[PDB]
Design a protein around this ligand. Structure first.
Ligand code: HEC
Ligand code: HEC
Ligand code: HEC
Ligand code: HEC
Ligand code: HEC
Ligand code: HEC
Ligand code: HEC
Ligand code: HEC
Ligand code: HEC
Ligand code: HEC
Ligand code: HEC
Ligand code: HEC
Ligand code: HEC
Ligand code: HEC
Ligand SMILES: O=S([O-])[O-]
Ligand SMILES: O=S([O-])[O-]
Ligand SMILES: [Ca+2]
Ligand SMILES: [Ca+2]
Ligand SMILES: [Co+2]
Ligand SMILES: [Co+2]
Ligand SMILES: [Co+2]
Ligand SMILES: [Co+2]
Ligand SMILES: [Co+2]
Lengths: 519, 519, 259
């Protein structure tokens, strides 16, 4: 078993760690729990690392003293439908194949499931690695603890001998790139420079061969993503978040300057060979909006194209690791500020944004957010125990499972059935609007080939392409966002109605132009 | 009540029956349980039947001594959604109406329900008899025991005075023909020659007036379909199965020669007037894959057309009673070996196969099949009794109802929730691919009229018709097959990805040709 | 918070502990979790204790690293009928009043309930302290966690000004004595010589005024009754059990020599 190391001896070189360690709730916790540094200590200097110490990045490294949190972390909600495709009449976006066209998400876009699986599902989804990585067995799909212990215990590589991205199954894509992994794992936290910049000290960067990167990575949503392992203090580690909030001065709540004062990120930079290498953002309070917003946001983590000139924007460019940090109504402008779009629709020829789970930016300005509610209040409350220390659950999930804690504690005039009914009322209403936005956008899209083939002018096409951008944005936001309007029902409603209005305008212009063209 | 007959007196003429009867577990069971042969005995010769003895073909004939099995046989799973149409966003094939076009299945293709109803549902489905046969009352839909006792106790004929197939309701078809009945009933087992050939001794054949045939038939999935009534030994009786396995030497497991040695059918032929009339296939072991594969397979039981010359293939031809006996990847070649296709798609003009429930041929080569699992292991296990003789259940149904017996006995590291989750993971994943295969195939189909009307060449159309055959096959297999991928998830995945690839190729060729044509 | 102490400094005078500590699964666990020894360290020599260091005996001292086991330890089984008298047709011994006569158990012998309550129940049962100690409230009967955290947070002394064993209610007995406590708590583990012999180093002994001893005791069935806190290894601490196994020569399984 473990033998404690002489922390003082570490502290002589590791002065920032000493400052954080000696003062927090891990003061008595020895380095050997998370680091094997014997050869390091024998070989390091004040400036050279010497032999690289091992850092244990498994969530299980925390389990020896925080079993309750680890067990909850690893737990699996079976009722979260697994590997359920959204392009599906039983799911979020029945017309998705028309709307997203040749985009990578057309190869597969499943609904989310439990956190334990995030890195595995990233590796094995059909859009990510050409089908290179597969569960070793269909039995393994249930194994949340296994996944937490390491992806490669439950999945395997169809060709360990090659590192190129290619299709191993016909209907897959190779959309993954190294930026993705930042929202699946932070095993690479010491191997990745801030933003994924190429860096002397970084094994991995935005431009790495993702298949090689993938093989170096094991655990989902590491515990230290939200808790500093040295001081225990709440933090974020996600580079693009710290970039938005601190570097670009946008604030933790970019729409609330007073709240951004009350909730803060304090950057801490770590160097390698005396140059800035990595950063964390220490939270002044444990605001889970920011912890969860490391991932549950709209982002670029993919190549794209410039709005100005159509030029590709490849992984070398920092824009491929970017948090827009903007609500649905400000998003188009935020994408313009970085001169960026994701894809050209294969049918309409319209430059389009690709929207991914903007839960936090939807949550901003909602009644609940305005009243200081955070994600964890509804998705990751404390357990309730008649006779025990009530720790925080650590696998976030629908409040439906825990309504007394999630809703009924603040809404005590309501029964569980009532609080669910209120949920369903909003989701149903919103879902309805998403289906209509789909109907109209699909109708618009489907009219494009008719227009083109009828000889409708580029001028008209171009005007409908401009409409498509907003029609798309104000639709996809909502199939991307996983609350089906619950997080911000009035915003979902305005925005989806805007999508519809844009689409109907687009359809009207195409219909008129086709009509004139044919006559 | 019954008076036993002198079996010895029967045995003098019935030497094959004697051999089977005296040696098995029915040695003490008198003929009068299943036959009323008094006038027969008085009138028969060594060669002429004389007066025809009555054979009791009701499953209830077995109930006097096998109540437990009969009751289970007659039971109704209420949770199997009844008369649920597959061409339906809530079911298997939302785009089915586009994909199947004018095919008979477009009038109705409901999901399966409990075995007790199979003959009734065959009679009354909208595609079968033009709506001629109807439940006497909508109350009767629940009556599984009634159906087992005789179809005509719960259903009725809208016009007993005529025997022609015609529509009694506007949106029905008259797809039924006599071959169908072989997978619904074997009441006609002594009235139908092997293969349904016209025969002096057969009242009924492939070419009979199906409405007259229908009225002669009463009970579903007769007990003796899987058990020889004389010896009790496991068997099959379905002619096209015995044809594939024995006559054509394909083996019980055509993809496993060693397994086909270990599991065997021994033909037994019965003559009439000294010529071969009917056959059964005695199983050496009670392998329910073969018992269930009498019906849960892909087959021809319908007229079609020749691939070579488009000529009709009518009921007179043996190909209209055929088991393809091939997996999805070998099916196209197997249909070519018999120079056959089912229908021309009304929109595309493509010759197409029509696929029906290929559960067994999907099951072949699956992990479970490879490990010697059989259908009944998951769908028809033994009951579990703390204090009773544990007989086999006899109404097959989803293992979800009986997970401890179906899954958890072999998978003891799993909870019920886990084993269901693994099921759902595969069905969800597969369903997703079926929806995309539908999207693409429908898009291909819908483009055909645009191509044709734009003046695209027959050469291009013909090339997309060739793609349609495979696009169709690798789609319909999976909406036809009722496990939604569970029976062979890797095969479903490869095949559905092939369907998609073919469709996308088809769409690409039509788009290019239309574009060139218009310019 | 806690600031670790230099354990190597401790080892300089605590070889017996070092030998247990450095070898086991608590090698990395600092003494400060369970001891306050700052003044001890300032004043001690190898031959002189100096200031007595504090030893934290709360099961909650272990909950910062073993919350799951602690929470389970504190849990209450509501189905275990509480305060159910055995001399009772609904219980174990309907004729117990005749059978036991004037024995102290005649004043109350309830069925056992959850471990969390064992010290509390010992203090408040009618046969033990003459009704001296009582739940502060009948509401307190549910509070397993409060009981684990300290008996005196949920129960109270009817007369803190006197130490004598006497009846406070007419049908009570004063059967409690210091030996009882050994099966309720080991808070007194450093204050009680083996067997409860009078001893210069022992505050408490078999012959102590049980009411004063009661007041010094807080936690039920301490985590360290079964687990050595320094090595983590399984152990027993109960003197009479060691005495039976070792001193009486009976072995761990007196009816099975091989075992
Ligand atoms: C024992 C050797 C531990 C290891 C391994 C880990 N933690 Fe820990 N942690 C430990 C103690 C004794 C405490 C203090 C308990 C107390 O409340 O006094 C903690 C505290 C934390 C906290 C909470 C801080 C708070 O504000 O309440 C967190 C968030 C925490 N520890 C996180 C954590 C992580 C992520 C770990 C793996 C990297 C981890 N701990 C390991 C003891 C030990
Ligand atoms: C943080 C800003 C993320 C980045 C970078 C990537 N993903 Fe992601 N992903 C994120 C969240 C919050 C969720 C749950 C919400 C949702 O839309 O499902 C996901 C989900 C996935 C999943 C599972 C569901 C699915 O789409 O099938 C997969 C397979 C996945 N993400 C893959 C993936 C890829 C390939 C990425 C780089 C191109 C990528 N993710 C980046 C958060 C973030
Ligand atoms: C961000 C998505 C987190 C992940 C990753 C981990 N934890 Fe966490 N933890 C998180 C929150 C929002 C809270 C509540 C904070 C508050 O003040 O309300 C916690 C709390 C803890 C604690 C403190 C005791 C408790 O409330 O349970 C500990 C010891 C802790 N977390 C440990 C821990 C472990 C071991 C993790 C990996 C298994 C882990 N956390 C990840 C948010 C997040
Ligand atoms: C990046 C490391 C993330 C952090 C931080 C948070 N979430 Fe997450 N979440 C993430 C992904 C990639 C997924 C998809 C996982 C998959 O394999 O499909 C999810 C999923 C969820 C869900 C759905 C859970 C379910 O049962 O379906 C919820 C409700 C959720 N996430 C909420 C959530 C909360 C509240 C967070 C802060 C406490 C949080 N997540 C952080 C990625 C990441
Ligand atoms: C309470 C007012 C909530 C707040 C705070 C957050 N979410 Fe939420 N979320 C809530 C509901 C009622 C639902 C619908 C769930 C249902 O069972 O119908 C959701 C949904 C999600 C999901 C998808 C979960 C699922 O359907 O299984 C995710 C991934 C999610 N929410 C994330 C999330 C984030 C990241 C939050 C902070 C930005 C957040 N939620 C807050 C209710 C509430
Ligand atoms: C009583 C007069 C019976 C009639 C009518 C039927 N069966 Fe029978 N069966 C009967 C007996 C006494 C036995 C032997 C019981 C034993 O285990 O010794 C059987 C056996 C069977 C078997 C099982 C053979 C085996 O391998 O275990 C089967 C499959 C069977 N019987 C089928 C069956 C059918 C389909 C019937 C209606 C046609 C039928 N039995 C009627 C007694 C009687
Ligand atoms: C054995 C090779 C069969 C032949 C010949 C016929 N059917 Fe069938 N049928 C078979 C199975 C294994 C099933 C269940 C699987 C499924 O696809 O549902 C069925 C089902 C039916 C049903 C009920 C569901 C429905 O389609 O509405 C009907 C009404 C039905 N079959 C009718 C039918 C007709 C009209 C046939 C001759 C054209 C026919 N069946 C033949 C197995 C077999
Ligand atoms: C094929 C689809 C079958 C139908 C039709 C009938 N039975 Fe069956 N039966 C079948 C199997 C797969 C088994 C188990 C065989 C094995 O060795 O595991 C059975 C078993 C019986 C038995 C034996 C006792 C038992 O296991 O229950 C009997 C007596 C029996 N079956 C009778 C029976 C009756 C009365 C039927 C019509 C109501 C009937 N079987 C139909 C498969 C099939
Ligand atoms: C021809 C006589 C069949 C035999 C032999 C087997 N099956 Fe069957 N099955 C058949 C039909 C025509 C149907 C459709 C019935 C209807 O009226 O819709 C079915 C249905 C099933 C089902 C679905 C049951 C439900 O609850 O929905 C299952 C699971 C099934 N069949 C399995 C099965 C098994 C395991 C068999 C061998 C033991 C078997 N069937 C034989 C036709 C016939
Ligand atoms: C265990 C490994 C199975 C084997 C062996 C067989 N089937 Fe199956 N089947 C299985 C599952 C998990 C499902 C999905 C059912 C669910 O509830 O999700 C099915 C489905 C069917 C069905 C449709 C039943 C329904 O959804 O109600 C049929 C008609 C069917 N399976 C037939 C069947 C045949 C004929 C088998 C031998 C060739 C066979 N199954 C084996 C699991 C298993
Ligand atoms: C809680 C997990 C502990 C830690 C860490 C340390 N000690 Fe301990 N110690 C603990 C208890 C509960 C007791 C009471 C006796 C028992 O066996 O349970 C003790 C006792 C001591 C003693 C007295 C031993 C004796 O002579 O009777 C000493 C000298 C002692 N402990 C020293 C000590 C040192 C130096 C530690 C850091 C290495 C240390 N303890 C850690 C509980 C716990
Ligand atoms: C963190 C600062 C701890 C304190 C306070 C306590 N324990 Fe502990 N314990 C801790 C660790 C890091 C470990 C090793 C876990 C591992 O994965 O190896 C342990 C282990 C135990 C064990 C079991 C050892 C085994 O055989 O597996 C026991 C029985 C144990 N700890 C008991 C215990 C007690 C009774 C405590 C209060 C006096 C206590 N621990 C405090 C971390 C910490
Ligand atoms: C002395 C410190 C004890 C140790 C060591 C163990 N037990 Fe115990 N147990 C003890 C008491 C004084 C009581 C009565 C508590 C009360 O307040 O009434 C108990 C009770 C039990 C029970 C009953 C719990 C219930 O739900 O009623 C059981 C089942 C029990 N004890 C079992 C048990 C086991 C298995 C032990 C070793 C792990 C154990 N006890 C140790 C005193 C003490
Ligand atoms: C260990 C050898 C013990 C001695 C010394 C004492 N008690 Fe005890 N007690 C012990 C156990 C294992 C149990 C549970 C089994 C049972 O008979 O209940 C108990 C229980 C109690 C209780 C609760 C039930 C009851 O009698 O009301 C009380 C109130 C109690 N014990 C008091 C008590 C007294 C007064 C003691 C000294 C005279 C005493 N206990 C010693 C284990 C042991
Ligand atoms: O692709 S991820 O952002 O769901
Ligand atoms: O039509 S039958 O084969 O379902
Ligand atoms: Ca995006
Ligand atoms: Ca067919
Ligand atoms: Co779902
Ligand atoms: Co998504
Ligand atoms: Co249904
Ligand atoms: Co069907
Ligand atoms: Co009781």
């Amino acid at each position: 078993q473990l033998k404690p190391v002489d922390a003082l001896q570490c502290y002589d070189c590791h002065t920032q760690i000493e400052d954080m360690h000696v003062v927090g709730k891990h003061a008595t916790v020895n380095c050997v729990h998370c680091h094997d540094a014997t050869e390091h200590v024998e070989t390091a200097s004040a400036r050279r690392m010497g032999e690289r110490p091992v850092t244990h990045t498994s969530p299980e490294a925390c389990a020896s003293c925080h079993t309750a949190q680890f067990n909850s972390f690893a737990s699996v909600r079976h009722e979260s439908h697994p590997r359920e495709e959204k392009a599906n009449p039983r799911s979020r976006s029945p017309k998705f194949d028309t709307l997203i066209g040749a985009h990578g998400f057309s190869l597969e876009h499943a609904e989310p499931r439990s956190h334990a699986f995030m890195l595995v599902d990233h590796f094995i989804v059909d859009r990510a690695y050409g089908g290179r990585f597969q569960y070793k067995s269909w039995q393994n799909v249930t194994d949340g603890l296994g996944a937490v212990r390491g992806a490669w215990t439950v999945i395997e590589d169809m060709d360990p001998t090659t590192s190129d991205q290619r299709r191993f199954l016909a209907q897959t894509a190779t959309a993954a790139n190294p930026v993705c992994l930042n929202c699946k794992t932070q095993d690479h936290i010491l191997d990745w420079a801030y933003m994924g910049d190429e860096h002397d000290a970084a094994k991995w960067a935005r431009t790495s061969k993702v298949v090689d990167f993938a093989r170096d990575l094991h655990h989902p949503v590491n515990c230290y993503m939200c808790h500093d392992p040295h001081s225990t203090e709440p933090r974020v580690v996600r580079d693009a978040l710290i970039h938005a909030v601190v570097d670009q001065g946008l604030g933790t709540y970019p729409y609330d300057e007073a709240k951004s004062e009350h909730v803060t990120l304090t950057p801490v930079t770590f160097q390698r060979g005396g140059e800035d290498f990595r950063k964390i953002g220490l939270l002044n309070v444990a605001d889970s909006n920011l912890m969860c917003g490391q991932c549950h946001v709209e982002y670029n983590c993919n190549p794209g194209f410039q709005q100005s000139d159509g030029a590709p924007v490849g992984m070398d460019d920092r824009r491929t690791n970017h948090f827009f940090w903007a609500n649905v109504f400000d998003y188009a402008e935020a994408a313009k500020e970085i001169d960026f779009f994701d894809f050209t629709h294969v049918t309409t020829g319209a430059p389009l944004p690709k929207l991914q789970h903007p839960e936090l930016e939807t949550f901003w300005g909602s009644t609940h957010e305005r009243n200081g509610v955070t994600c964890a209040d509804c998705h990751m409350p404390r357990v309730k125990l008649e006779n025990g220390k009530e720790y925080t659950m650590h696998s976030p999930r629908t409040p439906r499972d825990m309504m007394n804690r999630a809703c009924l504690n603040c809404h005590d005039g309501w029964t569980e059935a009532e609080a669910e009914y209120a949920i369903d009322y909003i989701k149903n209403y919103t879902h309805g609007k998403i289906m209509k936005a789909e109907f109209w956008l699909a109708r618009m899209i489907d009219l494009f080939p008719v227009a083109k083939r009828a000889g409708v002018s580029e001028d008209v096409l171009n005007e409908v392409r401009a409409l498509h951008y907003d029609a798309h944005l104000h639709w996809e936001w909502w199939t991307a966002e996983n609350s089906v309007g619950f997080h911000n029902p009035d915003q979902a409603r305005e925005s989806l109605m805007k999508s519809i209005t844009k689409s109907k305008e687009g359809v009207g212009k195409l219909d008129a132009a086709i009509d004139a063209a044919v006559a």
